[PDB]
Amino acid sequence: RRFCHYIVTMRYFEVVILVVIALSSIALAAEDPVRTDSPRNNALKYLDYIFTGVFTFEMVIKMIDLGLLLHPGAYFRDLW
Numbered sequence: 001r002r003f004c005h006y007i008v009t010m011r012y013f014e015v016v017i018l019v020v021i022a023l024s025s026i027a028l029a030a031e032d033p034v035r036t037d038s039p040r041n042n043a044l045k046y047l048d049y050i051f052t053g054v055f056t057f058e059m060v061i062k063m064i065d066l067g068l069l070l071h072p073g074a075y076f077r078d079l080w
């Protein structure tokens with residue numbers, strides 16, 4: 001399945017990741033600090049669920065494809 005992981009990251013995947021990043025940044029900029037229970041916060045929290053799911057899916061794909069700290073050139077070998 002590692003070849004599938006390699007091919008998924010190339011199937012226009014960076015653009016989708018960037019779109020998710022931008023939309024989640026706008027979602028962060030749209031929160032209401034003072035009204036902690038207003039419906040806007042309720043919608044943005046669902047948006048945050050979606051963005052968290054997408055990001056953790058990408059992170060798991062990266063773990064599987066590149067491998068953990070066991071060797072250089074893998075996950076945790078970058079601060080990013």
Ligand SMILES: CC(C)CCC[C@@H](C)[C@H]1CC[C@H]2[C@@H]3CC=C4C[C@@H](OC(=O)CCC(=O)O)CC[C@]4(C)[C@H]3CC[C@]12C
Pocket residue numbers: 025026029030040
């Ligand atoms: C090149 C990059 C840095 C562009 C940056 C643009 C956005 C990061 C910022 C600029 C001003 C922000 C907006 C300022 C406050 C509003 C109102 C906010 O809530 C409302 O619509 C008011 C109605 C209500 O409170 O119920 C929704 C998000 C929004 C559009 C924000 C969306 C994100 C915005 C567009």
